[model samples]
Target: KVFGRCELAAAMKRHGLDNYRGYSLGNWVCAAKFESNFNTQATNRNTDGSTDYGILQINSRWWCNDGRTPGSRNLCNIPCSALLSSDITASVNCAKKIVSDGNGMNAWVAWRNRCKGTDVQAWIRGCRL
Candidate 1:
Protein backbone atom coordinates (compact mmCIF):
# COMPACT_ATOMS: atom_id res chain seq x y z
CA LYS A 1 0.00 0.00 0.00
CA VAL A 2 0.98 3.71 0.25
CA PHE A 3 3.29 3.94 3.23
CA GLY A 4 1.75 5.47 6.40
CA ARG A 5 -1.08 7.71 7.44
CA CYS A 6 0.99 10.87 6.97
CA GLU A 7 1.73 9.93 3.39
CA LEU A 8 -1.92 9.44 2.71
CA ALA A 9 -2.58 12.84 4.31
CA ALA A 10 0.02 14.44 2.09
CA ALA A 11 -1.59 12.99 -1.00
CA MET A 12 -5.02 14.10 0.12
CA LYS A 13 -3.77 17.58 0.98
CA ARG A 14 -1.93 17.94 -2.32
CA HIS A 15 -5.16 16.95 -4.07
CA GLY A 16 -7.06 19.65 -2.11
CA LEU A 17 -9.31 17.18 -0.36
CA ASP A 18 -8.63 18.34 3.16
CA ASN A 19 -11.57 20.31 4.51
CA TYR A 20 -13.35 20.25 1.19
CA ARG A 21 -17.04 20.92 1.87
CA GLY A 22 -16.24 21.40 5.55
CA TYR A 23 -15.17 17.81 6.11
CA SER A 24 -11.88 17.51 7.98
CA LEU A 25 -8.76 15.85 6.66
CA GLY A 26 -9.00 13.42 9.52
CA ASN A 27 -12.39 12.30 8.34
CA TRP A 28 -11.01 11.66 4.88
CA VAL A 29 -8.06 9.72 6.24
CA CYS A 30 -10.18 7.61 8.51
CA ALA A 31 -12.60 6.83 5.73
CA ALA A 32 -9.82 5.85 3.35
CA LYS A 33 -8.06 3.72 5.91
CA PHE A 34 -11.17 1.83 6.76
CA GLU A 35 -12.52 1.65 3.26
CA SER A 36 -9.55 0.43 1.28
CA ASN A 37 -6.45 0.84 3.43
CA PHE A 38 -5.13 3.18 0.74
CA ASN A 39 -5.30 0.54 -1.97
CA THR A 40 -6.60 2.26 -5.09
CA GLN A 41 -7.46 -1.03 -6.73
CA ALA A 42 -9.89 -2.04 -4.05
CA THR A 43 -13.27 -3.35 -5.10
CA ASN A 44 -15.98 -5.08 -3.12
CA ARG A 45 -19.18 -6.63 -4.30
CA ASN A 46 -22.15 -6.00 -2.12
CA THR A 47 -24.89 -8.50 -1.46
CA ASP A 48 -27.27 -6.40 -3.49
CA GLY A 49 -25.31 -7.05 -6.72
CA SER A 50 -23.61 -3.64 -6.79
CA THR A 51 -19.89 -3.14 -6.27
CA ASP A 52 -17.84 -0.53 -4.47
CA TYR A 53 -14.81 0.90 -6.23
CA GLY A 54 -11.53 2.57 -5.24
CA ILE A 55 -10.35 4.09 -1.98
CA LEU A 56 -13.71 5.68 -1.35
CA GLN A 57 -15.53 2.46 -2.18
CA ILE A 58 -17.88 4.36 -4.47
CA ASN A 59 -20.87 2.27 -5.45
CA SER A 60 -21.37 1.02 -8.99
CA ARG A 61 -25.07 1.36 -8.33
CA TRP A 62 -24.66 5.13 -8.36
CA TRP A 63 -21.16 6.45 -9.07
CA CYS A 64 -19.36 4.52 -11.78
CA ASN A 65 -19.67 2.16 -14.72
CA ASP A 66 -18.35 -1.40 -14.54
CA GLY A 67 -18.55 -1.87 -18.33
CA ARG A 68 -19.71 -5.45 -18.92
CA THR A 69 -21.88 -4.82 -15.85
CA PRO A 70 -24.09 -2.08 -17.29
CA GLY A 71 -26.96 -0.62 -15.20
CA SER A 72 -24.83 2.11 -13.67
CA ARG A 73 -25.77 5.66 -12.78
CA ASN A 74 -22.16 6.79 -13.45
CA LEU A 75 -22.75 10.33 -12.22
CA CYS A 76 -18.99 10.84 -12.14
CA ASN A 77 -18.76 9.92 -15.82
CA ILE A 78 -15.82 7.62 -15.31
CA PRO A 79 -15.20 3.90 -15.48
CA CYS A 80 -15.02 2.17 -12.13
CA SER A 81 -11.49 1.04 -12.88
CA ALA A 82 -10.36 4.62 -13.32
CA LEU A 83 -10.79 5.16 -9.63
CA LEU A 84 -8.45 2.25 -8.95
CA SER A 85 -5.23 4.05 -9.60
CA SER A 86 -2.36 5.07 -7.37
CA ASP A 87 -2.81 8.50 -8.92
CA ILE A 88 -5.96 9.38 -7.03
CA THR A 89 -6.85 12.61 -8.78
CA ALA A 90 -9.86 11.20 -10.60
CA SER A 91 -10.98 9.35 -7.50
CA VAL A 92 -10.68 12.42 -5.34
CA ASN A 93 -12.52 14.63 -7.80
CA CYS A 94 -15.25 12.05 -8.18
CA ALA A 95 -15.53 11.77 -4.41
CA LYS A 96 -15.91 15.53 -4.20
CA LYS A 97 -18.70 15.36 -6.72
CA ILE A 98 -20.36 12.59 -4.77
CA VAL A 99 -20.21 14.61 -1.58
CA SER A 100 -21.48 17.70 -3.33
CA ASP A 101 -24.43 15.68 -4.56
CA GLY A 102 -25.51 15.76 -0.91
CA ASN A 103 -24.72 12.60 1.08
CA GLY A 104 -21.47 14.13 2.32
CA MET A 105 -18.92 11.50 3.45
CA ASN A 106 -21.90 9.50 4.54
CA ALA A 107 -21.62 8.11 1.03
CA TRP A 108 -18.83 5.92 2.49
CA VAL A 109 -20.13 3.23 4.76
CA ALA A 110 -16.73 3.11 6.47
CA TRP A 111 -17.17 6.70 7.53
CA ARG A 112 -20.57 5.98 9.03
CA ASN A 113 -19.47 2.75 10.70
CA ARG A 114 -16.04 3.83 11.93
CA CYS A 115 -14.99 7.43 11.43
CA LYS A 116 -18.30 8.97 12.40
CA GLY A 117 -18.43 10.16 16.01
CA THR A 118 -14.95 8.76 16.52
CA ASP A 119 -11.83 10.71 17.38
CA VAL A 120 -10.25 10.75 13.95
CA GLN A 121 -7.53 13.26 14.74
CA ALA A 122 -4.88 10.56 14.84
CA TRP A 123 -5.49 9.89 11.18
CA ILE A 124 -3.68 13.12 10.40
CA ARG A 125 -1.32 13.27 13.31
CA GLY A 126 2.22 14.30 12.35
CA CYS A 127 1.16 14.71 8.74
CA ARG A 128 2.62 17.67 6.87
CA LEU A 129 -0.34 19.40 5.37
Candidate 2:
Protein backbone atom coordinates (compact mmCIF):
# COMPACT_ATOMS: atom_id res chain seq x y z
CA LYS A 1 0.00 0.00 0.00
CA VAL A 2 1.02 3.58 -0.56
CA PHE A 3 1.09 6.28 2.11
CA GLY A 4 0.05 9.89 2.04
CA ARG A 5 2.87 12.33 2.72
CA CYS A 6 1.53 13.48 6.06
CA GLU A 7 0.57 9.94 6.89
CA LEU A 8 4.10 8.79 6.16
CA ALA A 9 5.48 11.66 8.17
CA ALA A 10 3.32 10.77 11.15
CA ALA A 11 4.21 7.13 10.91
CA MET A 12 7.93 7.78 10.77
CA LYS A 13 7.74 10.33 13.54
CA ARG A 14 5.97 7.78 15.68
CA HIS A 15 8.73 5.30 14.98
CA GLY A 16 11.53 7.56 16.26
CA LEU A 17 12.48 9.29 13.03
CA ASP A 18 11.84 12.83 14.24
CA ASN A 19 15.13 14.69 14.24
CA TYR A 20 17.10 11.48 14.04
CA ARG A 21 20.85 12.01 13.68
CA GLY A 22 20.63 15.75 13.10
CA TYR A 23 18.32 15.23 10.14
CA SER A 24 14.90 16.79 10.34
CA LEU A 25 11.67 14.83 10.08
CA GLY A 26 11.11 16.48 6.71
CA ASN A 27 14.43 15.16 5.48
CA TRP A 28 13.34 11.63 6.24
CA VAL A 29 9.93 12.26 4.76
CA CYS A 30 11.42 13.71 1.62
CA ALA A 31 13.79 10.79 1.20
CA ALA A 32 11.04 8.23 1.56
CA LYS A 33 8.80 10.16 -0.79
CA PHE A 34 11.24 10.09 -3.65
CA GLU A 35 12.57 6.64 -2.86
CA SER A 36 9.24 4.84 -3.05
CA ASN A 37 6.46 7.41 -3.29
CA PHE A 38 5.47 6.06 0.09
CA ASN A 39 4.72 2.62 -1.31
CA THR A 40 5.24 -0.11 1.19
CA GLN A 41 5.80 -2.85 -1.37
CA ALA A 42 8.10 -1.00 -3.71
CA THR A 43 11.18 -2.73 -5.03
CA ASN A 44 14.10 -1.61 -7.14
CA ARG A 45 16.99 -3.76 -8.31
CA ASN A 46 20.27 -2.05 -9.02
CA THR A 47 22.50 -2.68 -12.00
CA ASP A 48 25.05 -4.12 -9.62
CA GLY A 49 22.52 -6.83 -8.63
CA SER A 50 21.56 -5.32 -5.26
CA THR A 51 17.89 -4.78 -4.59
CA ASP A 52 16.16 -2.20 -2.42
CA TYR A 53 12.78 -2.60 -0.79
CA GLY A 54 9.88 -0.86 0.93
CA ILE A 55 8.97 2.74 1.73
CA LEU A 56 12.50 3.66 2.68
CA GLN A 57 14.00 1.41 0.07
CA ILE A 58 16.37 -0.46 2.34
CA ASN A 59 18.93 -2.21 0.20
CA SER A 60 20.15 -5.82 0.25
CA ARG A 61 23.79 -4.92 -0.17
CA TRP A 62 24.16 -3.71 3.40
CA TRP A 63 20.91 -3.57 5.32
CA CYS A 64 18.61 -6.54 4.73
CA ASN A 65 19.40 -10.04 3.62
CA ASP A 66 17.93 -11.08 0.27
CA GLY A 67 19.60 -14.54 0.33
CA ARG A 68 21.19 -14.09 -3.11
CA THR A 69 23.18 -10.90 -2.68
CA PRO A 70 26.71 -12.04 -2.12
CA GLY A 71 28.47 -10.73 1.00
CA SER A 72 25.41 -8.99 2.39
CA ARG A 73 26.02 -7.34 5.70
CA ASN A 74 22.49 -8.04 6.96
CA LEU A 75 23.07 -5.34 9.50
CA CYS A 76 19.37 -5.00 10.03
CA ASN A 77 19.15 -8.77 10.66
CA ILE A 78 15.88 -8.51 8.80
CA PRO A 79 14.73 -10.33 5.73
CA CYS A 80 14.00 -8.17 2.73
CA SER A 81 10.41 -9.36 2.95
CA ALA A 82 9.93 -7.54 6.22
CA LEU A 83 10.54 -4.16 4.59
CA LEU A 84 7.88 -4.90 1.98
CA SER A 85 5.20 -5.37 4.59
CA SER A 86 2.74 -2.66 5.58
CA ASP A 87 4.41 -2.48 8.93
CA ILE A 88 7.18 0.14 8.80
CA THR A 89 8.97 -0.98 11.96
CA ALA A 90 11.65 -3.01 10.25
CA SER A 91 12.37 -0.39 7.65
CA VAL A 92 12.41 2.45 10.10
CA ASN A 93 14.71 0.66 12.51
CA CYS A 94 16.97 -0.46 9.76
CA ALA A 95 17.03 3.04 8.34
CA LYS A 96 18.09 4.42 11.69
CA LYS A 97 20.86 1.90 11.88
CA ILE A 98 21.97 2.88 8.43
CA VAL A 99 22.11 6.54 9.31
CA SER A 100 23.85 5.86 12.58
CA ASP A 101 26.53 4.02 10.66
CA GLY A 102 27.90 7.53 9.93
CA ASN A 103 26.55 7.77 6.43
CA GLY A 104 24.01 10.24 7.76
CA MET A 105 20.99 10.71 5.49
CA ASN A 106 22.97 10.25 2.30
CA ALA A 107 22.71 6.46 2.34
CA TRP A 108 20.28 6.72 -0.56
CA VAL A 109 21.44 8.63 -3.60
CA ALA A 110 17.88 9.77 -4.10
CA TRP A 111 18.07 11.67 -0.86
CA ARG A 112 21.23 13.45 -1.88
CA ASN A 113 19.92 14.33 -5.30
CA ARG A 114 16.36 15.28 -4.41
CA CYS A 115 16.17 16.08 -0.76
CA LYS A 116 19.49 17.62 0.10
CA GLY A 117 19.81 21.39 0.44
CA THR A 118 16.20 21.93 -0.36
CA ASP A 119 13.34 23.47 1.54
CA VAL A 120 12.20 20.19 3.03
CA GLN A 121 9.47 22.03 4.88
CA ALA A 122 7.40 21.46 1.75
CA TRP A 123 7.69 17.76 2.32
CA ILE A 124 5.83 18.11 5.60
CA ARG A 125 3.40 20.81 4.63
CA GLY A 126 0.08 20.56 6.49
CA CYS A 127 1.60 17.99 8.84
CA ARG A 128 1.59 18.64 12.54
CA LEU A 129 3.96 17.63 15.31
Candidate 3:
Protein backbone atom coordinates (compact mmCIF):
# COMPACT_ATOMS: atom_id res chain seq x y z
CA LYS A 1 0.00 0.00 0.00
CA VAL A 2 1.50 3.27 -1.11
CA PHE A 3 -0.07 5.95 1.04
CA GLY A 4 -0.29 9.58 0.22
CA ARG A 5 1.52 11.96 2.56
CA CYS A 6 -1.40 12.95 4.72
CA GLU A 7 -2.86 9.49 4.47
CA LEU A 8 0.23 8.05 6.02
CA ALA A 9 0.35 10.77 8.64
CA ALA A 10 -3.20 9.99 9.65
CA ALA A 11 -2.43 6.32 9.91
CA MET A 12 0.55 7.00 12.14
CA LYS A 13 -1.54 9.21 14.39
CA ARG A 14 -4.35 6.66 14.48
CA HIS A 15 -1.91 4.03 15.63
CA GLY A 16 -0.59 6.12 18.54
CA LEU A 17 2.58 7.24 16.86
CA ASP A 18 1.82 10.86 17.66
CA ASN A 19 4.18 12.18 20.32
CA TYR A 20 5.57 8.75 21.00
CA ARG A 21 8.86 9.07 22.83
CA GLY A 22 8.91 12.80 22.30
CA TYR A 23 8.50 12.42 18.58
CA SER A 24 5.48 14.09 17.04
CA LEU A 25 3.09 13.00 14.30
CA GLY A 26 5.12 15.07 11.88
CA ASN A 27 8.31 13.36 12.93
CA TRP A 28 6.87 9.92 12.35
CA VAL A 29 5.46 10.91 9.01
CA CYS A 30 8.76 12.33 7.94
CA ALA A 31 10.63 9.19 8.82
CA ALA A 32 8.05 6.97 7.15
CA LYS A 33 8.32 8.89 3.93
CA PHE A 34 12.08 8.67 3.74
CA GLU A 35 12.23 5.13 5.08
CA SER A 36 9.79 3.58 2.65
CA ASN A 37 7.69 6.28 1.01
CA PHE A 38 4.68 4.99 2.93
CA ASN A 39 4.77 1.79 0.91
CA THR A 40 3.90 -1.27 2.90
CA GLN A 41 5.80 -3.69 0.71
CA ALA A 42 9.06 -1.77 0.59
CA THR A 43 12.30 -3.48 1.49
CA ASN A 44 16.07 -3.03 1.45
CA ARG A 45 19.14 -5.13 1.95
CA ASN A 46 21.97 -4.43 4.36
CA THR A 47 25.57 -5.22 3.59
CA ASP A 48 25.53 -6.95 6.97
CA GLY A 49 23.34 -9.55 5.18
CA SER A 50 19.99 -8.66 6.77
CA THR A 51 16.90 -7.18 5.25
CA ASP A 52 14.70 -4.22 6.11
CA TYR A 53 10.97 -4.82 5.80
CA GLY A 54 7.85 -2.76 5.39
CA ILE A 55 6.93 0.88 5.90
CA LEU A 56 9.39 1.73 8.61
CA GLN A 57 11.86 -0.72 7.19
CA ILE A 58 12.14 -2.72 10.38
CA ASN A 59 15.30 -4.74 10.36
CA SER A 60 15.44 -8.51 10.34
CA ARG A 61 18.63 -8.40 12.34
CA TRP A 62 17.31 -6.69 15.43
CA TRP A 63 13.55 -6.54 15.18
CA CYS A 64 12.10 -9.53 13.32
CA ASN A 65 12.97 -13.18 13.09
CA ASP A 66 13.30 -14.01 9.43
CA GLY A 67 15.21 -17.19 10.24
CA ARG A 68 17.89 -16.05 7.86
CA THR A 69 19.51 -12.97 9.40
CA PRO A 70 22.86 -13.91 10.81
CA GLY A 71 22.13 -12.75 14.36
CA SER A 72 18.52 -11.66 14.54
CA ARG A 73 17.29 -11.01 18.02
CA ASN A 74 13.66 -10.89 16.93
CA LEU A 75 12.89 -8.28 19.54
CA CYS A 76 9.56 -7.65 17.89
CA ASN A 77 8.93 -11.39 18.08
CA ILE A 78 7.11 -11.44 14.74
CA PRO A 79 7.82 -12.80 11.33
CA CYS A 80 9.41 -10.08 9.26
CA SER A 81 6.60 -10.46 6.74
CA ALA A 82 4.07 -9.01 9.15
CA LEU A 83 5.60 -5.62 8.58
CA LEU A 84 4.72 -5.80 4.89
CA SER A 85 0.98 -6.20 5.33
CA SER A 86 -1.20 -3.50 3.85
CA ASP A 87 -3.28 -3.02 6.98
CA ILE A 88 -0.17 -1.78 8.78
CA THR A 89 -1.44 -2.72 12.20
CA ALA A 90 1.36 -5.12 12.98
CA SER A 91 3.83 -2.71 11.53
CA VAL A 92 2.66 0.10 13.78
CA ASN A 93 2.48 -2.18 16.78
CA CYS A 94 6.00 -3.40 16.35
CA ALA A 95 7.24 0.07 15.67
CA LYS A 96 5.93 1.07 19.08
CA LYS A 97 7.75 -1.88 20.51
CA ILE A 98 10.95 -0.76 18.90
CA VAL A 99 10.56 2.70 20.32
CA SER A 100 9.68 1.36 23.72
CA ASP A 101 12.92 -0.56 23.69
CA GLY A 102 14.77 2.78 23.99
CA ASN A 103 15.74 3.11 20.37
CA GLY A 104 13.41 6.08 20.20
CA MET A 105 13.16 7.12 16.54
CA ASN A 106 16.84 7.12 15.80
CA ALA A 107 16.76 3.44 15.00
CA TRP A 108 16.37 4.44 11.39
CA VAL A 109 19.01 6.48 9.65
CA ALA A 110 16.14 8.06 7.76
CA TRP A 111 14.88 9.57 10.98
CA ARG A 112 18.32 10.77 11.88
CA ASN A 113 19.14 12.26 8.52
CA ARG A 114 15.76 13.06 7.02
CA CYS A 115 13.04 13.57 9.58
CA LYS A 116 13.89 15.22 12.90
CA GLY A 117 15.03 18.60 11.73
CA THR A 118 12.73 19.16 8.80
CA ASP A 119 9.43 20.96 8.53
CA VAL A 120 7.78 17.63 8.15
CA GLN A 121 4.35 18.87 9.14
CA ALA A 122 4.20 21.01 6.04
CA TRP A 123 2.66 18.05 4.25
CA ILE A 124 0.22 17.36 7.05
CA ARG A 125 -2.04 20.26 6.15
CA GLY A 126 -4.99 20.35 3.69
CA CYS A 127 -5.87 16.68 4.05
CA ARG A 128 -8.54 15.04 6.15
CA LEU A 129 -7.03 11.60 6.46
* TM-score of each prediction: 0.93, 0.96, 0.93
Q: After best superposition, candidate 3 residue 126: deviation in angstroms?
A: 2.0
Q: How many residue pairs collide in each prediction?
A: 0, 0, 0
Residue by residue across 1-129, what tens digits does model 3's lDDT show? Answer: 999888888888888888887777888787888999889999899999999999999999898988889857998889999999988888888888888777688888999987767787775777685
Model 1 clash number: 0
* Top of the candidates by TM-score: 2
Q: Highest lDDT among the candidates is held by which one?
A: 2
State the weakest 10-residue window (summed lDDT) of model 2: 120-129
Q: lDDT tens digits, residues 17-89, model 1?
A: 9999999999998999999998888889988788898888888888888864566588889988888888888
Output candidate 1 Cα RMSD: 1.3
Error of 1 at 16 (Å): 1.1
> By TM-score, how accurate is candidate 2?
0.96
Q: How far out, in Å, is residue 84 in model 2?
A: 0.8
Residue 105, candidate 3: Cα error in Å is 1.0
